[PDB]
Ligand binder design. Structure first.
Ligand code: NA
Ligand code: NA
Ligand SMILES: [Zn+2]
Lengths: 224, 218
């Protein structure tokens, strides 16, 4: 038994999300299983969206129901979900889950198989290369036995970027933070901590690549 | 609707110890058919959720016997007798008796370790960003434990809540600490009107505020 979700990846606000869950290893028709869609908004837990039973009866989460339509095509072994008028808050991983049971105590049902999920990001942005800013400490913060430098990667779309320090030769002492979507664009940051005898006497540079915009930039951290 | 309340929301353990997670529903979740559709799901990092327990107390196929569930009506408990590395992740209770079917908020099963004070570093805007008309101030708070921390920006002594973007790392796989980044984004003109920029943290490792500051003109 395998489930696999597919969807658009990226949508602009107001567009309709069309999701498909494709089943294999068993027949939807024969099994009498129900199928739900569940999502995980960015930074949130799981939320149940909609359910379709073997007989095409349907149930929805009233928090979202006005925007939702679940359907099925048993001849293709597929279940579908439409969500109208998408906006930022619909940015989530969407999961299909089978409501199975031991065959056939129908009352004893539960979500036994889940798909790998399909990611959606909702944004008005076009592909946008990052602005990469070197972060140097004020002079008074350079007097200790170690020093922390940073790199701020602001205003790009879509994910991902890759960030390294000194082309990957500086890997210890690094903290690279998960990207966050805000105002339609991503921001990421990274810090690196070295001994005071390492910097500024040796150069330290952050390297940032953004495959979608075909961009790659190096930024030396200059002392203030 | 049925609100599912899980307690605690973060559960630090040592591997080999017992773990217990509470799930309380706002009303009875016994279906008219006499079944209690209370289920527990685990989502490990990078994976989809997986079923552990259904009908309050029944283990799903493949689920080790160190997992058990109990409860009745409105009060439910998941127990892990001896926590393994592969058990780490987020646990959700779920009720399917009443529509909308609802999940608890999640419980992150994580590792215990000794407390560790954050290394806090603050950064003025770069000249590059200033020339484009913006001004981001960045504070990193690195390698701390426990994860509970309060971070506040102050500009000339006044708390600034708007314009902030925070990000956090997962618990470190080697040292079990947490790290955080906070960025306060202003306009260049606003940045240049103000003098003193402060990142203030409250963490159990210090009896007083942990403060890092700079002056725009230093
Ligand atoms: Na029954
Ligand atoms: Na001001
Ligand atoms: Zn209610």
């Amino acid at each position: 038994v395998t489930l696999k979700e597919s969807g658009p990846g990226l949508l602009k606000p107001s567009q309709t999300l069309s999701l498909t869950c494709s089943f294999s290893g068993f027949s939807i028709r024969t099994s009498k299983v129900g199928v739900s869609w569940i999502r995980q908004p960015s930074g949130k837990g799981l939320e149940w969206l909609a359910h379709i039973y073997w007989d095409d009866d349907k149930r929805y989460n009233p928090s979202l129901e006005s925007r939702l339509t679940i359907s099925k095509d048993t001849s293709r072994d597929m279940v579908f979900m439409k969500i109208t008028s998408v906006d930022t808050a619909d940015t989530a991983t969407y999961y299909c889950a089978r409501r199975g049971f031991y065959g056939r105590k129908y009352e004893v049902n539960h979500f036994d198989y889940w798909g790998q999920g399909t990611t959606l990001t909702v944004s008005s942005a076009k592909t946008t290369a990052p602005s990469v800013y070197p972060l140097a400490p004020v002079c008074g913060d350079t007097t200790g036995s170690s020093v922390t430098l940073g790199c701020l990667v602001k205003g790009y779309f879509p994910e991902p970027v890759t960030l390294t320090w000194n082309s990957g030769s500086l890997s210890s002492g690094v903290h690279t933070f998960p990207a966050v979507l805000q105002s339609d664009l991503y921001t990421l940051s990274s810090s690196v901590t070295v001994t005071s005898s390492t910097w500024p006497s040796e150069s330290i540079t952050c390297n940032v690549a953004h495959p979608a915009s075909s961009t790659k930039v190096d930024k030396k951290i200059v002392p203030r | 609707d049925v609100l599912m309340t899980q307690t605690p929301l973060s559960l630090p353990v040592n591997l080999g110890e017992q773990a217990s997670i509470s799930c309380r529903s706002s009303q009875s979740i016994v279906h008219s058919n006499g079944h209690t559709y209370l289920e527990w799901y685990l989502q490990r990092p990078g994976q989809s959720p997986k079923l552990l327990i259904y009908q309050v107390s029944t283990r799903f196929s493949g689920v080790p016997d160190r997992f058990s569930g109990s409860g009745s009506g409105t009060d439910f408990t998941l127990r892990i007798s001896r926590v393994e590395a592969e058990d780490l992740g987020v646990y959700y209770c779920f009720q399917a008796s009443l529509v909308p079917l609802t999940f608890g908020a999640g419980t992150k099963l994580e590792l215990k370790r000794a407390d560790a004070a954050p290394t806090v570093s603050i950064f003025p805007p770069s000249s590059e960003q200033l020339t484009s008309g913006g001004a981001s101030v960045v504070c990193f708070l690195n390698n701390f434990y426990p994860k509970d921390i309060n971070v506040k920006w102050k500009i000339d002594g006044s708390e600034r809540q708007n314009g902030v973007l925070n990000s956090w790392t997962d618990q470190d796989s080697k040292d079990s600490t947490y790290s955080m980044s906070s960025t306060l984004t202003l306009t260049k003109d606003e940045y240049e009107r103000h003098n003193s920029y402060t990142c203030e943290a409250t963490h159990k490792t210090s009896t007083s505020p942990i403060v890092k500051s700079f002056n725009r003109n230093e």
